[PDB]
Write a protein that binds this ligand. Structure first.
Ligand SMILES: NC(=O)c1ccc[n+]([C@@H]2O[C@H](COP(=O)([O-])OP(=O)(O)OC[C@H]3O[C@@H](n4cnc5c(N)ncnc54)[C@H](OP(=O)(O)O)[C@@H]3O)[C@@H](O)[C@H]2O)c1
Ligand SMILES: CCc1nc(N)nc(N)c1Cc1cc(/C=C/C(=O)N2N=Cc3ccccc3[C@@H]2C=C(C)C)c(OC)c(OC)c1
Length: 163
């Protein structure tokens, strides 16, 4: 009933490499935990295999065509259309295929911009700020543990109006 994208992508829109995050960034995991806590994560089968187990304290939903898929702690779905039946705040969690499928459908997007260029093999779909309003933009703090500049965006889809 309220559907969002949750993603971290670098300056070229890279989001993954060899089924892993290209970068080590603890604050963004804290970001993800705070945002989706008590809510619903919807993700594809490869993304789930990457994480390797349900995230606690929230509903984990996996989309796959495998009818044998039945993990403990994970609710499974078999079509995009199934996502609209999930109640509450749903976060499209990844990966590339689900982002491509969902980017025109979601209300808003919570994007962590990783301010670097990483080698990648999976990408977030292109988008333009002409379409998306910057609800907030906040620089992450850097320290010994979080050494890559990053920016937390909250983007809301702009309404189409006659001008
Ligand atoms: N930086 C970030 O914020 C971010 C977010 C999450 C993931 N990642 C990353 O994204 C990468 C992988 O992305 P990916 O696109 O290759 O895989 P993926 O999107 O995570 O999911 C792959 C799978 O989901 C399925 N699926 C997708 N649409 C479906 C539909 N309409 N009906 C039924 N099943 C459907 C299939 O499962 P089956 O083949 O089992 O049928 C499919 O092959 C990783 O390398 C990873 O680290 C990073
Ligand atoms: C972080 C990757 C990513 N980033 C963004 N912005 N959007 C996103 N949609 C994601 C998606 C994402 C995620 C993760 C990691 C999730 C995770 O490990 N947590 N998040 C929820 C959670 C809930 C309860 C307890 C612990 C956690 C834990 C956070 C810690 C404090 C350790 C991940 O594995 C490393 C991954 O690999 C492909 C992808």
């Amino acid at each position: 009933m309220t559907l969002s994208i949750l993603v971290a992508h670098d300056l070229q829109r890279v989001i993954g490499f060899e089924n892993q995050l290209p970068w080590h960034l603890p604050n963004d995991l804290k970001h993800v935990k705070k945002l989706s806590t008590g809510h619903t994560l919807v993700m594809g089968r490869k993304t789930f295999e990457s994480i390797g187990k349900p995230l606690p304290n929230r509903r984990n939903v996996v989309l796959t065509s495998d009818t044998s898929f039945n993990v403990e702690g994970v609710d499974v779905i078999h079509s995009i259309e199934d996502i609209y039946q999930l109640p509450g705040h749903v976060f499209i969690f990844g990966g590339q295929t689900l982002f491509e499928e969902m980017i025109d459908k979601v209300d808003d997007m919570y994007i962590t911009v990783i301010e670097g260029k990483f080698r990648g093999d999976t990408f977030f779909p292109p988008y333009t700020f002409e379409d998306w309003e910057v609800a907030s933009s906040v620089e992450g703090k850097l320290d010994e543990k979080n050494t890559i500049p990053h920016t937390f965006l909250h983007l809301i889809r702009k309404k189409l109006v006659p001008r």
